[PDB]
Write a protein that binds this DNA or RNA. Structure first.
Length: 96
DNA sequence: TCGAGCCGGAAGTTCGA
DNA sequence: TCGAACTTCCGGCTCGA
């Protein structure tokens, strides 16, 4: 149920790239049971990132991390050209 | 009536080549 | 060693049941 370290064989040393990590988990088969991955073009909707958020804060060594941290940090992620936010709903995420 | 989610600017330490 | 990178910090706004 963890196509993460099972597919790319994640090493315990040398943290991967942030958007690469999300993108790596993005193509997760179980994401359907923990989130919504439509099988059409390329649209990703966050229904209940309960484990995704905890894991996001787990790498940061924190007990519980608020998802607002993603909106506050991820939004500021407009550094170059990678994950853009969709002006649809407040939970719609998309990549280009 | 009441609380929850949403995000602007700022600062500071550390990463890969 | 160089420049850049992501996180955490402070507090204000508005809608739905």
């Amino acid at each position: 149920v963890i196509p993460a370290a099972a597919l790319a064989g994640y090493t315990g040393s040398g943290p991967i790239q942030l958007w690469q990590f999300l993108l790596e988990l993005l193509t997760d088969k179980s994401c359907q049971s923990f989130i919504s991955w439509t099988g059409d073009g390329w649209e990703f909707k966050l229904s209940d990132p309960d484990e995704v958020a905890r894991r996001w804060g787990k790498r940061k060594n924190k007990p519980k991390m608020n998802y607002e941290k993603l909106s506050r940090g991820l939004r500021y992620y407009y550094d170059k050209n990678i994950i853009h936010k969709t002006a649809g709903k407040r939970y719609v995420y998309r990549f280009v």
